[PDB]
């Protein structure tokens, strides 16, 4: 019945009411993206291979010499989608764009922070599985992406910060979800040591600045 720093709630009997709530750990409303608006219009050279082994993206052009200055900031633009077809070309396209080719991923990563962070601001628990799988794959399948991302932990790490410790507390209980990577506080760990392992020197400071419980391994 009480409210706070008043003449009430200084009584010898009272029940106080604290703060209402906070917008952390709770899922956010979504927004219309741009991959929707450009897939219906029809510029994408993608179709859907329907194999016996699963589903794969069919390609009607070169994957190597694509215009990645248009496209790489347009599939992270549609990473934030949960309806079935639209998440599939977004997730499966990004892997095949990245493992092909080279010597062009350096000047396009300045323009990717807006739909990396907006993929992560949503507080949903399957994109944070998916978008934190490619951040390991982003750093590996290129050369010298490490030294270009070292002033870029100030903008993407606050959302690894709140969720870095997400694990399972079960004593001798065997788990069965280690096949897929559902468990996020696992996946936030080995992504952060993947940032420090690459990036050269002087990047061990720049996670300790941001996720404060960090311990700079790999001397």
């Amino acid at each position: 019945v009480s409210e706070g720093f008043t003449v009430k709630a200084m009584m010898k009997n009272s029940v106080v009411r604290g703060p209402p709530s906070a917008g952390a750990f709770k899922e956010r409303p979504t927004k219309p993206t741009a991959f929707r608006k450009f897939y219906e219009r029809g510029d994408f050279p993608i179709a859907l291979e329907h194999d016996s082994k699963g589903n794969k993206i069919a390609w009607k052009v070169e994957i190597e010499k694509l215009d990645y200055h248009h496209y790489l900031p347009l599939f992270f633009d549609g990473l934030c989608e949960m309806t079935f077809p639209y998440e599939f070309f977004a997730r499966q396209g990004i892997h095949d764009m990245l493992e092909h080719g080279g010597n062009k991923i350096l000047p396009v990563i300045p323009q990717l922070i807006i739909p990396i962070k907006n993929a992560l601001n949503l507080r949903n628990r399957q994109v944070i599985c998916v978008t934190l799988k490619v951040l390991q794959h982003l750093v590996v399948s290129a050369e010298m992406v490490g030294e270009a991302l070292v002033p870029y932990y100030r903008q993407i790490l606050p959302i690894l910060n709140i969720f870095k410790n997400k694990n399972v507390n079960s004593g001798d209980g065997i788990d069965y979800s280690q096949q897929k990577r559902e468990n996020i506080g696992d996946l936030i760990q080995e992504t952060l040591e993947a940032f420090e392992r690459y990036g050269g020197e002087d990047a061990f400071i720049n996670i300790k600045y941001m996720v404060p419980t960090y311990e700079s391994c790999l001397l």
Partner: protein, 436 residues
Amino acid sequence: MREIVHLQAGQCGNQIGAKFWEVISDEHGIDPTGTYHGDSDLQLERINVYYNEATGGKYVPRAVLVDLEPGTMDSVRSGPFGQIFRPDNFVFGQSGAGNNWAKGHYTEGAELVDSVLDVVRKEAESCDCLQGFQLTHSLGGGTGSGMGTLLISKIREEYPDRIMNTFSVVPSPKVSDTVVEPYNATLSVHQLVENTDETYCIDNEALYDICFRTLKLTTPTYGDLNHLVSATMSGVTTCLRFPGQLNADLRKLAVNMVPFPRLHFFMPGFAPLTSRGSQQYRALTVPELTQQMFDAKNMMAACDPRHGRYLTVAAVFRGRMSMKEVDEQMLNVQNKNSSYFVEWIPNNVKTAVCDIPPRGLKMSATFIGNSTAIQELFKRISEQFTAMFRRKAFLHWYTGEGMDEMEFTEAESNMNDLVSEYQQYQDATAEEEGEF
């Protein structure tokens, strides 16, 4: 032996530090012309934290005053105590910013800052051991705010092991003179998170609400509001200037309130504020400093602390007081209201006492309480700014002055940085995985 240099920014900066120096000069007993017509020795023990000696028995501040209008800051000499300043310290431009932070950053502020830094080095190598500097400004205009960003961002780069206080008037939600307020307000704070690590965020409508509902003035002016802010500016750093039973300098509070190196936007207050008709009738005890100082009415910023969680609390007291009663009031409030106060800090309040009160008062106290209801100021600044910036309202007097358009887009997510950080440390739990 711990000197400090006062640097004031802009029209409101020179209006605030013209009454702050009346406050210091009257509490150190010195006349309008400069001389010590005072009756103590505690008024000339530690006067070298602020003042400085001339030949013939005169004291001058270490005050350097910056402005981008020529006729503004030579209306400050014409005040009562306005001739105590040495005239080399006055620095002023020719063509003003035009209430635009871009004109105060790139174009017209970048040629005054060399001369400003020359006077700053002259006033800052003179000392014994320089503790720090002070800044005073508002985040509505451009001469104050754009220069106030540029000079702190190029003063920390050469004096980095020093302390650097900031007084910021953040713009108000529901009273708003300047139409182009949110551009300046969301472009200044990413400089003030990187550049100061110490900033007191005060607000004009909260300064109005005290003068309407507590002091009950029929007609408050900007002199009365400036008199409110300077009586907190003094009481924060009394303990440098006066002896104490338990004392605490500015380095003592700066290490203590800030848990992680961004979380430094604080909300002042002042304890025995009383109407003139109800002044004589009302007692002054330490419960009647604590109840009035923690009160959500008598706060000095627009954030209501009941909409969040206190991160750390200060209190600086002035008078002759008893340490048992001073140290039990904080415990009484903190364990009697214990859903606000943050869980993983077990005793959250820091306290100091000083012996020498303000003039005519038997006791006083001052509040600096780091709360997590500062998320709301950032959210409403972001809302008005992105509402204007979605259809690109007034962009060209900032964009024809040498700017990219994506500096705005990064200067909104350097603000959504701190919104989510203050939402993290407010909902963080004593035992993890209690809330997922």
